[PDB]
């Protein structure tokens, strides 16, 4: 006979306190961008990105994360 | 005989406190963009992006995340 | 006979306190970008990125993380 | 004969620039106040103030001041 | 004969620049105040202040000041 008892107990805490959060300045690509092109030959796919792209300002008050994985495999 | 008892208990907390959250400035692509092109040959697909694209300001008051996965596999 | 009792107990804490969080300045790509190109031959795929791209300002009040993995494998 | 010519010229500037102004916390009188009084004799005027009074939070974006006085006295 | 020519010229500047201004915490009187009084005789005026009074948080973005006085006195 086989008897499995899976009782994981979790009374955990993930916590943050912040008195104030702010005065955040993100200024990407203030400078001048100049792209001058003459007599170019492309014989395959071209991907081009010019300027200010994909810039992120991420300011969570918390930003706290908990990842928990439980796996019981009987064979 | 096989007896499986799967009783995971979770009394967990993921918490944030923030007194104030703000004064956030995101200014992408303030500068000048100049793209001058002359005599270009393309023989395949072209993807072009010019200017200020896909810029993100993300400011959650919380932004707290919990991921939990439970898997019981009997074979 | 086989008897397995899986009782992990977790009363853990992951905590942060911050009195104030701020006055953060991120200024990527203030300078001038000049790309001058003449008589270029490309016989395969081209990926080009020019300017200020993929710059991140990430300011969580907490940013606290807990990862827990539980695995019971019976064979 | 008396000839007075009063021509003061003022092309002056008083200026401020502020990118962001904020996340200001003023918390006066968080503590407990206990005033226990027994058998007091007052034979003249009494002024009493108890608690949290006359507290100021003053946050001007500018707060710039110019005072100019012109006085011509002929006798 | 008397000839007075009063031509003061002022092309002056008083200037400030601030990228960010903030995360200011003023917490007066967090502690406990206990005033226990027994058998007091006052034969004249009494002024009493107890607790958290007249506390100031002053945060001007500029706060720039110019004082100019002009005085011409003829006798």
Residue numbers in the entry:
A (entry chain A), B (entry chain E), C (entry chain B), D (entry chain D), E (entry chain C): 305 to 379
Paper text:
pmcAmyotrophic lateral sclerosis/parkinsonism-dementia complex (ALS/PDC or lytico-bodig) is a fatal disease found in the Chamorro population of Guam (1–4), some families on the Kii peninsula of Japan, and the Auyu and Jakai people of New Guinea. Abundant filamentous amyloid inclusions that are made of all six brain tau isoforms are characteristic of ALS/PDC. We now show that tau filaments from Guam and Kii ALS/PDC adopt the CTE fold in brain and spinal cord. The greater heterogeneity of amyloid filaments, when compared to CTE and SSPE, probably reflects the fact that ALS/PDC is a multiple proteinopathy based on neuropathology, as suggested for cases from the Kii peninsula.
Tau filaments with the CTE fold were present in all cases. The spinal cord from case 2 had only Type II filaments, whereas that from case 3 contained a mixture of Type I and Type II filaments. High-resolution structure determination confirmed that the tau filament structures from Guam ALS/PDC are identical to those from CTE. By cryo-EM, we have shown that tau filaments from AD and CTE each consist of two identical C-shaped protofilaments that comprise residues 306 to 378 (in the numbering of the 441 amino acid tau isoform). They differ by the presence of a hydrophobic cavity in the CTE fold, which encloses a nonproteinaceous density of unknown identity that may be involved in giving rise to this fold. The CTE tau fold differs from the Alzheimer fold by having a more open conformation of the β-helix region, which contains an internal density of unknown identity. Type I and/or Type II CTE filaments were present in brains and spinal cords.
